[PDB]
Ligand binder design. Structure first.
Ligand SMILES: CC(=O)N1[C@@H]2CC[C@H]1c1c(ncnc1N[C@H](c1ccc3c(c1)S(=O)(=O)CCC3)C(C)C)C2
Length: 169
């Protein structure tokens, strides 16, 4: 079955959240789209990007290198649609701002706007973790920006509980 999301808690009409590893969810669910928390050169060296790349056994990286060769880098707030390989039908590579490297938090709304071109997505919390944005603020931006159906996988129970407590739904 496609998009077989299970165990999510519905926060709003179109945003759901689960304490889970996004790669494990991609393998179980088989979604139409998995979102990658990418950088502008599509180099998947660690974190969510490294984990998704490793589960495709480097097929994501080879295809990403070919995208960059022909099209050039993305911009912060921008995206591209590539194959999802064995994890999903497509991978939506989205570049949120890295506030730990000085990029502007205003581009986080632009980053989430890319999700609106896909009816259903499995995604991570953009710009959270090593990108340095306040994860609770990133969830508020997601809720206010995304209008399609988004299932967020957040792999830290401590953070998940703080997000659910802040949201109160
Ligand atoms: C095994 C493991 O701990 N994980 C893998 C890959 C990373 C971690 C993980 C997995 N699935 C979902 N959220 C995860 N981490 C969250 C998260 C959310 C967004 C971002 C990152 C991290 S990042 O990679 O640090 C920078 C890009 C944006 C974290 C906040 C708990 C699966």
């Amino acid at each position: 079955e496609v998009n077989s999301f299970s165990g999510y808690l519905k926060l709003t009409d179109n945003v759901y959240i689960k304490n889970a590893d996004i790669v494990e969810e991609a393998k179980k669910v088989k979604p139409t789209v998995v979102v990658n928390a990418a950088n502008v050169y599509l180099k998947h060296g660690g974190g969510v990007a490294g984990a998704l790349n490793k589960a495709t056994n480097n097929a994501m990286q080879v295809e990403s290198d070919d995208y960059i060769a022909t099209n050039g880098p993305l911009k912060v707030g921008g995206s591209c649609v590539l194959s999802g390989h064995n994890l999903a039908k497509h991978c939506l590579h989205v570049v949120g701002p890295n506030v730990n490297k000085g990029e502007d938090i205003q581009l986080l709304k632009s980053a989430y706007e890319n999700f609106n071109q896909h009816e259903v997505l499995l995604a991570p919390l953009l710009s959270a973790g090593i990108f340095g944005a306040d994860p609770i603020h990133s969830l508020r931006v997601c809720v206010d920006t995304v209008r399609t159906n988004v299932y967020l996988a957040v792999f830290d129970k401590n953070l998940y509980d703080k997000l659910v407590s802040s949201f109160l739904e």
